Amino acid sequence: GAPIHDPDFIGGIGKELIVDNASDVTSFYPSAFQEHLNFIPAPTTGSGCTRIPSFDMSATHYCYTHNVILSGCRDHSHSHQYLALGVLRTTATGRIFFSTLRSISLDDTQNRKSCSVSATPLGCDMLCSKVTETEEEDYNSAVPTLMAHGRLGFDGQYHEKDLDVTTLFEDWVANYPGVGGGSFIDGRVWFSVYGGLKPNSPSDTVQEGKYVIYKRYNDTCPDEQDYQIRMAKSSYKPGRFGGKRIQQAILSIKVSTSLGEDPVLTVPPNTVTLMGAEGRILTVGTSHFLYQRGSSYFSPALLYPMTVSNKTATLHSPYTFNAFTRPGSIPCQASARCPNSCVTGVYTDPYPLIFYRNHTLRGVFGTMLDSEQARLNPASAVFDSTSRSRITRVSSSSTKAAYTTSTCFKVVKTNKTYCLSIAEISNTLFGEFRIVPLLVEILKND
Amino acid sequence: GAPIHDPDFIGGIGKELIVDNASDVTSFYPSAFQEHLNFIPAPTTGSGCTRIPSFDMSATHYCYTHNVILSGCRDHSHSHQYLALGVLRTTATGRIFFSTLRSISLDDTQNRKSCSVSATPLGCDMLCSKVTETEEEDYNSAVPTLMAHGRLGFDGQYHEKDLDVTTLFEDWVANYPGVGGGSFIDGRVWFSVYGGLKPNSPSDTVQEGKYVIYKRYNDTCPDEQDYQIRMAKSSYKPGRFGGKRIQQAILSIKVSTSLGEDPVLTVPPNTVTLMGAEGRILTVGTSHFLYQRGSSYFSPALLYPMTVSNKTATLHSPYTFNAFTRPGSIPCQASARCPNSCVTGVYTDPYPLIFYRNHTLRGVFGTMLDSEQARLNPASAVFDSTSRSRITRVSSSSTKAAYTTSTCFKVVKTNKTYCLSIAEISNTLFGEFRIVPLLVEILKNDG
Ligand SMILES: CO[C@@H]1O[C@H](CS[C@]2(C(=O)O)C[C@H](O)[C@@H](NC(C)=O)[C@H]([C@H](O)[C@H](O)CO)O2)[C@H](O)[C@H](O)[C@H]1O
Ligand SMILES: CC(=O)N[C@H]1[C@H]([C@H](O)[C@H](O)CO)O[C@@](O)(C(=O)O)C[C@@H]1O
Ligand SMILES: CC(=O)N[C@H]1[C@H]([C@H](O)[C@H](O)CO)OC(C(=O)O)=C[C@@H]1O
Ligand SMILES: CC(=O)N[C@H]1[C@H]([C@H](O)[C@H](O)CO)OC(C(=O)O)=C[C@@H]1O
Ligand SMILES: CC(=O)N[C@@H]1[C@@H](O)[C@H](O)[C@@H](CO)O[C@@H]1O
Ligand SMILES: CC(=O)N[C@@H]1[C@@H](O)[C@H](O)[C@@H](CO)O[C@@H]1O
Ligand SMILES: [Ca+2]
Numbered sequence A: 001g002a003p004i005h006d007p008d009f010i011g012g013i014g015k016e017l018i019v020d021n022a023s024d025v026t027s028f029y030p031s032a033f034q035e036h037l038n039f040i041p042a043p044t045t046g047s048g049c050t051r052i053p054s055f056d057m058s059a060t061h062y063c064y065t066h067n068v069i070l071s072g073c074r075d076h077s078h079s080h081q082y083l084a085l086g087v088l089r090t091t092a093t094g095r096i097f098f099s100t101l102r103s104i105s106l107d108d109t110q111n112r113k114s115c116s117v118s119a120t121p122l123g124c125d126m127l128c129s130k131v132t133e134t135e136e137e138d139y140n141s142a143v144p145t146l147m148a149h150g151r152l153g154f155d156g157q158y159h160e161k162d163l164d165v166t167t168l169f170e171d172w173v174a175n176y177p178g179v180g181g182g183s184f185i186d187g188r189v190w191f192s193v194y195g196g197l198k199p200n201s202p203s204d205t206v207q208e209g210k211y212v213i214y215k216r217y218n219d220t221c222p223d224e225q226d227y228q229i230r231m232a233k234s235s236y237k238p239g240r241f242g243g244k245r246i247q248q249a250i251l252s253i254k255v256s257t258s259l260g261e262d263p264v265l266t267v268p269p270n271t272v273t274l275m276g277a278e279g280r281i282l283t284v285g286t287s288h289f290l291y292q293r294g295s296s297y298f299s300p301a302l303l304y305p306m307t308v309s310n311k312t313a314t315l316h317s318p319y320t321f322n323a324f325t326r327p328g329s330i331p332c333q334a335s336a337r338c339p340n341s342c343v344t345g346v347y348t349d350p351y352p353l354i355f356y357r358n359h360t361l362r363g364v365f366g367t368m369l370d371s372e373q374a375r376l377n378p379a380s381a382v383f384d385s386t387s388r389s390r391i392t393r394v395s396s397s398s399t400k401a402a403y404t405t406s407t408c409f410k411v412v413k414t415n416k417t418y419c420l421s422i423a424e425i426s427n428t429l430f431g432e433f434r435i436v437p438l439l440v441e442i443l444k445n446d
Numbered sequence B: 001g002a003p004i005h006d007p008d009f010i011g012g013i014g015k016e017l018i019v020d021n022a023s024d025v026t027s028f029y030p031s032a033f034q035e036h037l038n039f040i041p042a043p044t045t046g047s048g049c050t051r052i053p054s055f056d057m058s059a060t061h062y063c064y065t066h067n068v069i070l071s072g073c074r075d076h077s078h079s080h081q082y083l084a085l086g087v088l089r090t091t092a093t094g095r096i097f098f099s100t101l102r103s104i105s106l107d108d109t110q111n112r113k114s115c116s117v118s119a120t121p122l123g124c125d126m127l128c129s130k131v132t133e134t135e136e137e138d139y140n141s142a143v144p145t146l147m148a149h150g151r152l153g154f155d156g157q158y159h160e161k162d163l164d165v166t167t168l169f170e171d172w173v174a175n176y177p178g179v180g181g182g183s184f185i186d187g188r189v190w191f192s193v194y195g196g197l198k199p200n201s202p203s204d205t206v207q208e209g210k211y212v213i214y215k216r217y218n219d220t221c222p223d224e225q226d227y228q229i230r231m232a233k234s235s236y237k238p239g240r241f242g243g244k245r246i247q248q249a250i251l252s253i254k255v256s257t258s259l260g261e262d263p264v265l266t267v268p269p270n271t272v273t274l275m276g277a278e279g280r281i282l283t284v285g286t287s288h289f290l291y292q293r294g295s296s297y298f299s300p301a302l303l304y305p306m307t308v309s310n311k312t313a314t315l316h317s318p319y320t321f322n323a324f325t326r327p328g329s330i331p332c333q334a335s336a337r338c339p340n341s342c343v344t345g346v347y348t349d350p351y352p353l354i355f356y357r358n359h360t361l362r363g364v365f366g367t368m369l370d371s372e373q374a375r376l377n378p379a380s381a382v383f384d385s386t387s388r389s390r391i392t393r394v395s396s397s398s399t400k401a402a403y404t405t406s407t408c409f410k411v412v413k414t415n416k417t418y419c420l421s422i423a424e425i426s427n428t429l430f431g432e433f434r435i436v437p438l439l440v441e442i443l444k445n446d447g
């Protein structure tokens, strides 16, 4: 009885979209942006701050959420979340439109932040942190960040349960969802999570001495090997948050009428993962991936293959897309090639788009910020390990922007492949930002 | 079970909101704009044109729609409509939000234009014209404009039936819905319509020689009496559309599973109505009103009292709000005071807000374009027959805008009055316009 996408999409959601072994990845490219039903609310006042979009779509419905601050993006006192659950549909003319069925403003007195959502068989699951301090202050206070698992049901009602962070995140000083969407796998919902570890705690100790260096395709770091290792190690304890170890983690929760049931946190070894950061758990076909924002020295987009075993997950050496860089402050700018300590960058995920016949990933779609340091010029394109296809731009003029989260699918009825790319774009008259659901069709030269 | 607004709204939709006789209407004014769930889709491309908003809300649900053109606002080849049916709700903190339940893009082989919506017990009824020519070309072709009565049901399905315009609008050369919302009254849905009459037809001949002159509060027109009457008569047949008589009308349709059932057209005498124009049918309390856009020489916002008798309607001398002017090209600019012939102005309606104890309307809320000739600088405020309260501005800087349609309501629990004001505002990067649902609370000078 639950909602489902129109018949035109059945079988075209969350699967390997393009399988070719001959064609060059970059022979595929995005069309000009397309006009479709903008399902994302824009601000209604001059100061309203709408930011931090999260989106996930299963074979039956999609979920979306973003944060809203009344006075501006700088205010940290209180805020509310917009939540939407809907399904994909097509017009009589074959035009797609995300048709939301449940649209609500979640505003009590709790300050939910850095929320991630995931489409599960019971509706739209959301994981958020509840803050009573600034991020800097959070990392400075020994106790972990409070968190809650909530869900917007098909009936439009929202229910949630606060997680026992004192136990679940006993070894952490701060912990937040990765904002990127979560994914439903084997009866459990999986969320990317990150934060700071309590020094000398068991979690901190096991990571002691663990690091991993990922390099730029055709740009070797000149520094002596011993120095790179030194910097690689320190990259996990950047100065931004008082030298606390910023760790990557994955949280899985059983999906049931009981929210927060049987939570299990997985902390991958830092011999594979770079400094903890925002991220997303993706499922395309039978493959799973952890996207990790390039908040550290590594600029190319990362996708760590992810396999699940019961309630825990295992990550492997990541796929990297050298041309899919992100802006960052020096010495961690887009063109950075050496290990260093920093907490910068921006969330701009890559969606698995092209695969080999044997299911290894070849190319992805994404909207990068085509800039060295400043958060500017959104550019949608198709990427492989080293290059970028022809691009599609929001504007030929200098344009301020931030986060982008892309999800691709296929309209089986028209046999056309599309990619939704939700991007925070600068705005005028109504708030600092406008979260726009950009849409493009994936094309191929000839 | 059909959808319904949250309990906090029961008894706060479509009623006289403020009944006062001892206070000055302008002592009531709008608060600063409030941040709330923006239920109106903005463009997603640089050329996308989202325009022509229509909105209506009943005691159970609200309805909204707007037109979308892919290449820009000047392209008339094809387009589609965005349609939404939803209900009002409140957050845990008591914040209000319009929660849409059915959200669709309606795009087929037909080009629906100038559409109006109305919340009926069966869903969201829509009246549109289906065009295959420019407005100019339409008035030149003798046959009437094709029209259709559609409906977005609670189940999210859209159905429609073309009206037999050859018979229904036999005397017309062009006919469109007034874009403003329609209203459900006594088992029927009522829509404002306007267009041009076929010269010398029965409808045309009966209106020949008929006219009415409405004046500005103080500003008396200096022109000679006989000259004014001549200008007034001519205002009904402006040159823009070749001397055709632009006529105002009201269409009622029976609300049932059968769309377009028993349509009846009412053409009011031009001894009461000014040149035909876009409009809206409003129902507040037991009173009904026809808002008529000031497309002719009259600038002040207009609300004609409307009484219904079975399937037909009767209009009466209108309420006028002298300070609620609208921009227009000379000699029909905001400060115009004399009868004249023109087709200008813009749609910016007034919502009945304050009533006298005996139910006579005293004040309204609306968002005017505070400019003489250019469509600029939106200003939300409360108006009485002669003045305007303090205002709330979209921006202190010069701002391009267009249509505005307002609807007010109340949260009986907190006894707080709110006004939604949907306004077409200029945009950057994504299309020429952004239709924004502005929201204010109605406050009072001294309490
Ligand atoms: C220009 O100084 C600011 O003026 C503000 C006035 S209140 C208000 C207005 O003009 O009415 C409230 C409006 O809702 C608001 N508009 C929107 C869209 O949010 C409007 C604009 O913010 C203002 O006009 C700038 O364009 O302001 C208020 O006193 C501020 O505190 C002043 O700094
Ligand atoms: C928002 C938008 O529609 N962007 C479009 C842009 C802009 O119109 C121009 O860059 C002018 O700024 O033009 C494109 O050809 C491009 O650059 O990729 C297609 C793209 O869809
Ligand atoms: C929990 C929190 O504050 N998240 C913020 C995130 C964070 O600072 C980064 O992941 C480094 O920790 O950065 C930004 C941002 O535009 O970059 C916005 C998020 O609000
Ligand atoms: C049917 C039609 O074309 N409607 C148009 C309307 C019309 O020109 C006017 O009501 C004169 O009749 O004006 C305008 C306008 O922004 O002013 C936009 C509408 O799209
Ligand atoms: C799972 C598997 O067989 N992977 C291989 C990959 O190693 C190889 O590089 C590619 C061709 O070059 O084919 C497949 O993708
Ligand atoms: C129909 C009717 O009785 N209207 C009267 C109106 O004439 C008068 O100006 C006002 C103020 O007392 O009260 C009512 O509105
Ligand atoms: Ca803490």
Ligand SMILES: [Ca+2]
Pocket: B137, B138, B139, B140, B141, B142, B143, B144, B145, B173, B174
């Ligand atoms: Ca015609």
